[PDB]
Design a protein around this ligand. Structure first.
Ligand SMILES: NS(=O)(=O)c1cc2c(cc1Cl)N[C@H]([C@H]1C[C@H]3C=C[C@@H]1C3)NS2(=O)=O
Ligand SMILES: N[C@@H](CCC(=O)O)C(=O)O
Lengths: 380, 89, 169, 85, 49, 99
């Protein structure tokens, strides 16, 4: 959301054409510093990281080295190698490297979720067992011996009611009285002991570990997965950050970025966003912190931010080295920080485009009270 | 001396797991990292269904063999004898 | 109930799943598995209890469950007991005033369902062990209906036999 | 040593009786026969309204104790101080 | 009526007794005031700088 | 009855260190930063401007942060979340049922 064109961009021309975070930022700088600005998009499309040995960092910084542009109100990482060629002001945002992955799609709601701890084959074969036992308990209890066969209260419809009473654990007023009738009632008691307790035990299991999680939600988890490949933006400081790696888990990440089958890099961050969505859980993409939370607030909300930031870098307004214009601009960064404007401009573009509306802070608690939507089927 | 150097920094620890495990493709080390709960399948619980049909097979059989008996312990003087043989055994 | 089972023994859309048809969806069955939605369509192959990467050796649990499944002895016994039950119904008109063939019929109709219900189980238990998103079609629901219809005949065979010996009473 | 994997083990036909060991299933049946014979012997001690009031024969006391164990109780209750223990 | 209410009982009781040990031993924190907006709407406490 | 306001790295240092009887709630109301200060126009200003970016990119400031906040204070609750144990009931747990 730094600089992106209006919806009517083909109609408008000039500085009124572009909008975004930096466009609102460039308005507030000249309001306090006292100049007039003109926006020029780079023809590259890459942020302007290290040059291919040519040394003219190809991108933003090459426009800053060449003297073509006066200031860079732009998303541009303040790192060491950019500092030696051009000037930066103080940072206006704080951000880190972050792993962005696909949603797990482990949500799984239901209306008849009470029939879930047993399969559909068993709930079918219970009814077949219910009918089959009830007629055998009938055919046993009614043979040739007033009449002495009339002493039994076991008609078929009482036999339907006895087998339901044993299965529902409630018990019945009638009970079988003959030796052949106590066999059929005895084995059905052993049937309803195992099958009901298989239900009551597994329904405890489906009411403790029902949750959505991602298995690769940490830094070291993403390092060890050859199944979940990972790459980042080409010609960026993030790619340069793994070129100069120090830590052993960061060196482990740099091994798989070299031996990548196929090449894990993309030309633009949104192409890496589109690559994870086509990969459907088998590829991860490492981009910025403030970029990742903007992807969450857009359509179709099929990404998620896992883990904290790897480091703590920032973006800064940049001038070429030795420029007189840029020293009150350094004060202009400190002014917009002090009067809350850098907060308020960040409060502008990150609030109004919250179409997703999830605000997924999450509930790490495991003791969740049952909602009515969980067990609304048995009320129906 | 160079081997005794590399063994003490842990390079040979770092080289051995890298070539054996990381070049290898078997993911049994992280297959157990996640665990699931599933529904009971009928292959899991079928012996109770086997006893039940086996119980219904016995239930119809005893009602039949007693019925043909009626259509067509016992005698106290010998139940004392079965008690004595029972008490001896 | 006899006509529902003899269809379901003969017909072969018992199971819809992803499987091969010559050695992706299938018209599987007890004997002849077939195929639809492919370059081949309807080139039915007689299924075999394969040991190739089944890796069962002296597994008396697994071998007996599959040998009963490869023989399908319980759905076939669900036919033989059900026809002999129908032979007792035909022998109620002829050889009448015997009154014990009506008892004899209701045993065979109930035991046909007992042959049917465990024939359902040895079909399902031998099946699983992947075939994700499998479907049971409507051949399986014929034998499901052949269970319930055969019971109500064995119900009404007893209730006639009740009235036969209340007449003798 | 190198072997081929077990590739997994299926749970058996009678896997429902795995939460208790086979010593317990012997001792439950021994506790079943032990309670049933005692409950018959307690209630029949020669006090027709004499000796025939109690329904608890040996075959009923098998059916009460298996009824009480399978969590579906039966109609008959001991109705005596030494029987209800 | 009795047959369905029994099936209602078997689900509601088994959903009740599924995790009854944990709901008697919850061990959770209260978290009374947070995020400076509940601080704006609860002034029994005193502030400090 | 007293809610005190201070800076973020103070509140984390208080809560990690024993007797650990306060709690950090909410986020940062205003984000700001500590900076190494030099006199204006000093020759010792520009390598200082480069040296902080050296330590941040290489990971020294990350390595200095993980060292110092772990070394001095460790309240036991911050790493005790993985341990789960079971206990008996108490009469205090079920007392209204008796009531
Ligand atoms: N957290 S954040 O990215 O929203 C963010 C981060 C930062 C902001 C403002 C915001 Cl909104 N301004 C500060 C500024 C205050 C003074 C210290 C650093 C600059 C000058 N820099 S920062 O610490 O990099
Ligand atoms: N703002 C970043 C974008 C590229 C990246 O994230 O590496 C830069 O110019 O360095």
């Amino acid at each position: 959301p730094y600089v992106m064109m209006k919806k009517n961009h083909e109609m408008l021309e000039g500085n009124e054409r572009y909008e975004g975070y930096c466009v609102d930022l460039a308005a507030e700088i000249a309001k306090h510093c006292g100049f007039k600005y003109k926006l020029t998009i780079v023809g590259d499309g890459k942020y302007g990281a290290r040059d291919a040995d040519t040394k003219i960092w190809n991108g933003m910084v090459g426009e800053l080295v060449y003297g073509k542009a006066d200031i860079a109100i732009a998303p541009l990482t303040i790192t060491l190698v950019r500092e030696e060629v051009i000037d930066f002001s103080k940072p206006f945002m704080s951000l880190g490297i972050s792993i962005m992955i696909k949603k797990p799609q482990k949500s799984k709601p239901g209306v008849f979720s009470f029939l879930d701890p047993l399969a559909y084959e068993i709930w079918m074969c219970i009814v077949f067992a219910y009918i089959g036992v009830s007629v055998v308990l009938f055919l046993v209890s009614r043979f040739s011996p007033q009449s002495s066969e009339s002493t039994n209260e076991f008609g078929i419809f009482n036999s339907l009611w006895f087998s339901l009473g044993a299965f529902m654990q409630q018990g019945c007023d009638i009970s079988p009285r003959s030796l052949s009738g106590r066999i059929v009632g005895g084995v059905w008691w052993f049937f309803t002991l195992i099958i009901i307790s298989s239900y009551t035990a597994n329904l405890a299991a489906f009411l403790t570990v029902e949750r959505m999680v991602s298995p690769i939600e940490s830094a070291e988890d993403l390092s060890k997965q050859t199944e979940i490949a990972y790459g980042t933006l080409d010609s960026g400081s993030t790619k340069e950050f793994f070129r100069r790696s120090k830590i052993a888990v960061f060196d482990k990440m740099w091994t798989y970025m070299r031996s990548a089958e196929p090449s894990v890099f993309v030309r633009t961050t949104a192409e890496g966003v589109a690559r994870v969505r086509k990969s459907k859980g088998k590829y991860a993409y490492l981009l910025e912190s403030t970029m990742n939370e903007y992807i969450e607030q857009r359509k179709p909300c099929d990404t998620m931010k896992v883990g904290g930031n790897l480091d703590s870098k920032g973006y800064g307004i940049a001038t070429p080295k030795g420029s007189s214009l840029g020293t009150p601009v350094n004060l202009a960064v400190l002014k917009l920080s002090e009067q809350g404007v850098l907060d308020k401009l960040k409060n502008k573009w990150w609030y109004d485009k919250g179409e997703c509306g999830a605000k997924d802070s999450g509930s790490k608690e495991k003791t969740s009270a049952l909602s009515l939507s969980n067990v609304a089927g048995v009320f129906y | 001396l160079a081997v005794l150097k590399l063994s003490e920094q842990g390079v040979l620890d770092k080289l051995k797991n890298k070539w054996w495990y990381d070049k290898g493709e078997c993911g049994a080390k992280d297959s157990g990292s996640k665990e699931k709960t599933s529904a009971l399948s009928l292959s899991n619980v079928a012996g109770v269904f086997y006893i039940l049909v086996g119980g219904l097979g016995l239930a119809m059989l005893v009602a039949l063999i007693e019925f043909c008996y009626k259509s067509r312990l016992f005698d106290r003087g010998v139940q004392m004898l079965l008690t004595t043989v029972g008490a001896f055994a | 109930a006899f006509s529902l089972m003899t269809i379901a023994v003969g017909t072969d859309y018992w199971l819809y799943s992803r499987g091969v048809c010559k050695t992706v969806m299938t018209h599987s069955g007890l004997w002849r598995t077939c195929c639809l939605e492919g370059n081949f369509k309807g080139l039915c192959k007689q299924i075999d209890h394969f040991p190739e990467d089944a890796d069962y050796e002296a597994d008396t649990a697994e071998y007996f469950l599959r040998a009963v499944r490869a023989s399908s002895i319980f759905p076939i016994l669900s036919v033989i007991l059900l026809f002999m039950g129908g032979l007792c119904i035909a022998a109620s008109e002829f050889y009448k005033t015997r009154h014990n063939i009506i008892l004899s019929a209701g045993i065979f109709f109930v035991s046909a369902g007992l042959s049917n219900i465990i024939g359902i189980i040895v079909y399902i238990s031998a099946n699983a062990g992947k075939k994700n998103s499998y479907s049971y079609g409507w051949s399986f629901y014929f034998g499901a209906l052949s269970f319930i219809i055969a019971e109500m005949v064995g119900v009404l065979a007893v209730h006639m036999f009740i009235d036969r010996h209340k007449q003798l009473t």
